[PDB]
């Protein structure tokens, strides 16, 4: 299909929760030793997806 | 407008 | 860590992050190169028999993404694991020969 229009509207907490792939429960970013993302933190792969393709 | 001042004022009421 | 928004210059016009390349996403050139490699590989594999091209494709993961064992490819073609090892080896032999002749796949060796 071809885009003919762009709508903008307020988002219910429901819709925001429907966007979300997970809750970020922790202020952590990445592990100080491994440099890998910390689980439940802002960079978590379980939430936002894998760092490397199909792995 | 200053959260610190506000908090100090609330603290001072006890 | 340091801010990507760290200012460069005394004007507000530029940021540090603006000078940092993306090393993750493939460049147009790299994508192109990989595509050409797949196409030259298929061209070279067409100079084999369907069966001996299929054995190689099945063994090296070009099909299905997994590398099949000799016992699996052999069981798939109804032949013996030794038979399939043999047709794989003669297939690879023809590939190497056509390669020495046409010099096509050399430049993709980096």
């Amino acid at each position: 299909k071809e885009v003919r229009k762009v709508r903008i509207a307020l988002a219910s907490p429901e819709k925001i929760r429907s966007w979300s792939y997970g809750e970020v429960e922790k202020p952590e970013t990445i592990n100080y030793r491994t440099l890998k993302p910390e689980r439940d933190g802002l960079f978590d792969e379980r939430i936002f997806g894998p760092i490397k393709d199909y792995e | 407008s200053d959260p610190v001042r506000q908090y100090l004022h609330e603290i001072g009421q006890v | 860590p340091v801010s990507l928004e760290t200012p460069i210059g005394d004007e507000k016009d530029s940021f540090y992050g603006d000078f940092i390349p993306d090393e993750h996403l493939p460049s147009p050139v790299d994508a192109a190169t990989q595509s050409l490699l797949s196409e030259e590989l298929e061209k070279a594999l067409s100079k084999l028999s369907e069966r001996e091209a299929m054995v190689l494709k099945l063994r090296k993961g070009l099909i299905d993404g997994r590398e099949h064992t000799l016992e699996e490819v052999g069981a798939f073609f109804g032949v013996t694991r030794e038979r399939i090892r043999q047709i794989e080896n003669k297939a690879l032999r023809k590939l190497k020969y056509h390669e020495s002749r046409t010099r096509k796949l050399r430049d993709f060796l980096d």
């Binding site: 762009v6 903008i8 792995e55 | - | 005394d10 993306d22 460049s27 590939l95 390669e99 060796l109």
Partner: protein
């Protein structure tokens, strides 16, 4: 050759040390050469005295000392070190209870040292701290814009040293004080100061109607304590009004010398304006338990006296240079020092509570980190701390003399209207009216005048000669603008016989206003015209003949001149070109009288009168900040007798001690085949042949090998999959050999990096299987020569880990630096300029046979279009050309001073003497007038240039006195149909060179978030196609081109990939897709809790994330 200097003006004093504004300022700030007991309370000393004693245990300051630098300057530049001295302070800890005294000298870190030339070396790079102009502290009275018959009194302290206070008379009649955006009645504060109705009535009563407006019964009723608590409740609402808190706060706002500092200049200006004496730098005092007024009553009194129209009371011009002052290096640095010191003091006070209250040394109490950080912050990250401009010696000399109204504690660019950017009448002799940047910074960045010096208070002073009776003394008085306004000052060119004024009427100034005056009325006289202009402006001959707008460009552009291998001083100088070189410190001179023992490319050894043998090493092929080569060449020979101050070696861009920013070329002013079009310039290939305008440039390349979690980066000659052709010029260790020629693509330093873990694609599995070759563990990370660069490798520096004397930043095993040099010949697109603001790019280099030429066969060097002259109104270049012709034939150079110069008659005379040589030679050689010279003479008398009936020789001489000659077109052999202006002009090659600016990109690096190409040549960036460019494409109605710019050529990932593949396959480029930056916009709006939905015609959602972002 002979040097003939014009002008009758005798300057009683020489130019001041030119970098003294930097040097003396910093010297005064550090007081390093003064023994501690003899130090004045100023600079660093004053900062310590202000910060200490730290009360709470009591910590007191005794004295400080500065050590010697750990490393010399050259070493610092080499190793990325700051050139600096260790600072120590002797502190004594005292317990006032016990009487106990522990005393120690604590190390406070290092402070950067100024070099001999007034600059700094900060982390290996040379920097200048630019002086900052601002409003002088003091007490000012300005007209209130709203109410005409009323005024505002403004009390201004030093920046960061207090709030400003404004005293106003409100429409209701009561006098209000404004502090920290809050207003209150001034009467209340007066009551806190202990004033009573009686005192105010007797004091201010003389000005009738205002004092009753000052009267408030309730305030006078309550004693100063109640008034202090009341005032505190006004200033700090919601804060419980404990009396001690009120005392502390008001003291800190007004009487505290730590939190409130009027300048010393602030104090002086206040005392002078209000006619009082300050006991200190604060608006009031805390003495014997109460508050005592200092400032407020005199300022209020002056305000009322002004409103009432009392004689002797004036409003202040805030752009007057009496009210505007300079903060030099010392003051700025000292400010940051004071800040770091206050922080260190906070730390001390906090340490005086915790820990053991008994056992403490001064060493335990003091953490110097805040101080070190404040200073390191000032020198590294300040706006006033700038990368030094050292393109040529004059560049840095000028840089150090610049004055900025920008920077911290000063104007922003919107904050700057016309008033500030204006040339004030008081700029005369102080700030140059000419040299300022063209564009947005105009009037904000300015330059110190040549004879100007900044006094101890920070006001710019200019010299004048005393005139008593009609006699001009040789005694000079440096005056501020305020003191200058008192006298009647005659112009420097006013006629003199001996020391007596020889004119019946003289041209003078009274408060900047030009006036005709009798010799009896002349109090002072200008030292020189040079004093009106900056150093750059003073280097422009015939400046009086140049329109200011162009002279500006001349000034600024001398800054951009590149040092040339064959560089020469101009044939017409102003007489400053020697001094500039000397003050620059680039050239080398002899200390005392003596004899030269040794002369080398690398060094000069001199045996002086003392008998002592001094060796001067010479800086050879060193790379400046801008990559121009700084190198010294010996000007003396072995056994030569030299005197004190005699030239030993020439620095860069100097010839025998004279400033050489360019070359002297033979120029013709005439159009040539449109190659001259619109300021473009035509030059002769002869210039390249003889290596005129050739310059040396050095670029520095650097690479680090560091520890990785994947294993070590290694600098090695062993690089995977590389031919011996590729490795040829690399040594055993992998570094390119000295003397090798490197071109784009060539390896400078070989390096391997351990491959990031990856699963080889099935394609790579099959390939690897076909060739039977293991994929290597390491990847080729080598440093290569970038596009458009390259040259000869002149140097390599290698620094490893675990070798003596060197330690790198954490994780870094080794660092390699490669210095690559290039000899740059003048080429098409390179930029030339003269000192008059004539500038142009070289569009054509013709072979010598096409060049216009004189009858005797001499071809011209440069051809300049006359169309550049008339609109620009810079005629100085013309006079320069004429005098240059005369000098070309007489074999001589001239000094024509600014505003007292060679005038037309004298130039005509020189031209005649020149013609004799240009022609009489020919007549003696047995040649008569040419046929074509006759034709040209015919057309010339048709033009009214020559008088009809005179001999051809007489007419040719008539033309030559007009600076015009017969010129032959090298293509035809036929003459140009009219006589043409030809002569020697001084022209410089500027720092803007096509080699540096030429850039192109097919595909390349992209940005992280936006996925759009990076910027700049250095990142291999794409050009910015901006809003206005898009507008252009829209107005053309070119939709597909525009769409390409927005998609295939930028952030459409699928699109650009597909486009590349299609183009290399010969297919037409594919239909574009969604730009990644739109997806970025959508997600960013989702982060703002806004739902942005792309819809089809049926109002159904369209997914531009292609299922990837939805569960």
């Amino acid at each position: 050759m002979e040097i003939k200097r014009f002008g009758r003006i005798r300057e009683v004093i020489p130019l001041p040390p030119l970098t003294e504004i930097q040097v003396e300022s910093y010297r005064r700030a550090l007081q390093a050469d003064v023994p501690p007991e003899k130090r004045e309370n100023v600079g660093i000393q004053a900062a310590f005295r202000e910060t200490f004693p730290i009360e709470e245990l009591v910590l007191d300051f005794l004295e400080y000392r500065l050590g010697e630098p750990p490393f010399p300057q050259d070493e610092c530049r080499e190793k990325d070190l700051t050139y600096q001295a260790p600072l120590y302070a002797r502190l004594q800890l005292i317990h006032k209870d016990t009487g106990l005294i522990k005393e120690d000298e604590v190390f406070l870190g290092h402070i950067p040292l100024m070099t001999e030339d007034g600059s700094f070396i900060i982390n290996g790079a040379d920097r200048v701290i630019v002086s900052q102009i601002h409003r002088s502290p003091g007490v000012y009275f300005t007209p209130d814009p709203a109410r005409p018959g009323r005024y505002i009194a403004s009390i201004i302290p030093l920046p960061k040293r207090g709030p400003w206070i404004d005293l106003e008379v409100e429409p209701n009649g009561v006098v209000s004080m404004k502090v920290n955006k809050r207003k209150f009645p001034l009467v209340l504060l007066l009551r806190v100061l202990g004033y009573d109705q009686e005192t105010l009535a007797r004091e201010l009563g003389a000005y009738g109607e205002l004092v009753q407006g000052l009267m408030d019964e309730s305030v006078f009723a309550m004693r100063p304590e109640e008034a202090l608590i009341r005032l505190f409740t006004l200033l700090r609402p919601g804060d419980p009004p404990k009396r001690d808190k009120a005392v502390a706060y008001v003291y800190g706002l007004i009487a505290d010398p730590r939190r409130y500092d009027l300048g010393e200049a602030g104090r002086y200006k206040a005392e002078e304006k209000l006619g009082i004496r300050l006991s200190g730098r604060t608006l009031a005092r805390f003495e014997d338990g109460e508050f005592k007024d200092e400032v407020f009553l005199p300022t209020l009194r002056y305000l009322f006296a002004l409103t009432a129209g009392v004689p002797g009371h004036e409003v202040d011009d805030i752009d007057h240079l009496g009210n505007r002052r300079i903060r030099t290096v010392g003051e700025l640095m000292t400010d940051q020092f004071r800040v770091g010191l206050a922080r260190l003091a906070r730390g001390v006070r906090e340490r005086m509570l915790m820990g053991s209250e008994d056992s403490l040394t001064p060493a335990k109490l003091v953490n110097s980190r805040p101080l070190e950080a404040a200073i390191r912050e000032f020198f590294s990250r300040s706006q006033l701390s700038q990368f030094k401009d050292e393109t040529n010696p004059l560049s840095s000399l000028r840089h150090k003399r610049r004055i900025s109204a920008l920077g911290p504690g000063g104007l922003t660019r919107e904050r700057a209207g016309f008033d500030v950017r204006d040339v004030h009448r008081t700029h005369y002799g102080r700030i140059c009216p000419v040299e300022t940047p063209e564009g947005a910074n105009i009037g904000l960045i300015t330059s110190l005048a040549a004879y100007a010096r900044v006094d101890e208070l920070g006001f710019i002073r200019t010299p004048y000669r005393r005139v008593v009776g009609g006699v001009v003394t040789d005694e000079v008085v440096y005056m501020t603008a305020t003191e200058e306004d008192r006298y009647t000052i005659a112009q420097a060119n006013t006629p003199l016989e001996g020391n007596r004024i020889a004119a019946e009427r003289v041209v003078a100034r009274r408060k900047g206003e030009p006036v005709i005056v009798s010799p009896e009325e002349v109090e002072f006289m200008d030292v020189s015209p040079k004093q009106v202009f900056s150093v750059n402006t003073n280097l422009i001959p015939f400046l009086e003949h140049d329109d200011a707008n162009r002279a500006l460009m001349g000034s600024n552009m001398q800054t951009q001149a590149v040092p040339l291998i064959r560089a020469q001083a101009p044939v017409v100088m102003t007489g400053l070109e020697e001094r500039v070189v000397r003050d620059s410190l680039a050239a080398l001179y002899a200390e005392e009288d003596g004899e030269v023992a040794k002369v080398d490319g690398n060094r000069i050894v001199v045996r002086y009168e003392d008998g002592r043998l001094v060796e001067y090493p010479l800086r050879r092929f060193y790379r400046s900040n801008q990559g121009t080569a700084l190198d010294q060449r010996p000007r003396v020979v072995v056994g030569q007798r030299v005197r004190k101050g005699d030239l030993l070696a020439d620095g860069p861009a100097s010839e025998n001690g004279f400033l050489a920013l360019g070359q002297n070329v033979l120029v013709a002013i005439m159009p040539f085949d449109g190659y001259n079009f619109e300021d473009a310039i035509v030059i002769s290939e002869e210039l390249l042949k003889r290596d005129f305008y050739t310059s040396i440039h050095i670029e520095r390349y650097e690479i680090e090998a560091r520890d990785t979690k994947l294993g070590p980066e290694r600098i090695t000659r062993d690089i995977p999959h590389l031919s011996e052709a590729a490795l040829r010029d690399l040594d055993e260790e992998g570094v390119v050999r000295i003397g090798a020629e490197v071109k784009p693509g060539d390896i400078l330093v070989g390096r391997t990096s351990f491959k990031g873990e990856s699963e080889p694609t099935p394609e790579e599995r099959l390939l690897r299987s076909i060739f039977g070759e293991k994929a290597r563990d390491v990847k080729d990370t080598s440093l290569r020569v970038p596009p458009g660069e390259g040259g000869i490798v002149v140097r390599t520096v290698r620094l490893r880990r675990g070798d003596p004397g060197v330690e790198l930043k954490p994780g870094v095993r080794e660092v390699v630096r490669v210095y690559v040099a290039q000899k740059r010949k003048l080429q098409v697109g390179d930029k030339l300029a003269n000192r008059h603001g004539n500038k142009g790019v070289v569009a054509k280099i013709l072979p010598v046979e096409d060049m216009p030429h004189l009858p005797d066969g001499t071809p011209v060097d440069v051809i300049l279009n006359p169309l550049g002259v008339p609109s620009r109104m810079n005629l100085g270049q013309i006079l320069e050309t004429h005098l240059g012709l005369a000098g070309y034939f007489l074999g001589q150079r001239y000094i024509s001073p600014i505003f007292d110069g060679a005038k037309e008659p004298e130039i005509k005379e020189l031209l005649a003497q020149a013609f004799e040589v240009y022609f009489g030679k020919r007549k003696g050689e047995g040649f008569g007038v040419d046929k074509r010279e006759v034709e040209v003479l015919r057309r010339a008398e048709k033009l009214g240039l020559v008088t009809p009936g005179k001999t051809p020789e007489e007419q040719l001489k008539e033309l030559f006195l007009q600076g015009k000659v017969v010129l032959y077109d090298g293509r035809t052999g036929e003459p140009i149909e009219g006589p043409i202006v030809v002569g020697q002009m001084f022209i410089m090659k500027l720092y803007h060179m096509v080699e540096d600016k030429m850039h192109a990109r097919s595909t390349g690096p992209y940005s992280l978030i936006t996925q759009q190409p990076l910027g700049g040549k250095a990142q291999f960036g794409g050009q910015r196609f901006g809003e206005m460019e898009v507008w252009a494409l829209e107005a053309y109605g070119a939709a597909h081109t525009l769409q390409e710019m927005l998609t295939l050529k930028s952030d459409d990932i699928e699109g650009r990939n597909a486009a590349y593949e299609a183009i290399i396959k010969g297919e037409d480029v594919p239909e574009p897709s969604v730009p990644e930056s739109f997806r970025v916009l959508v997600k960013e709006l989702q982060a703002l809790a806004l739902d942005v939905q792309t819809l089809d015609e049926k109002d159904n959602p369209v997914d531009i994330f292609e299922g990837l972002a939805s569960k």
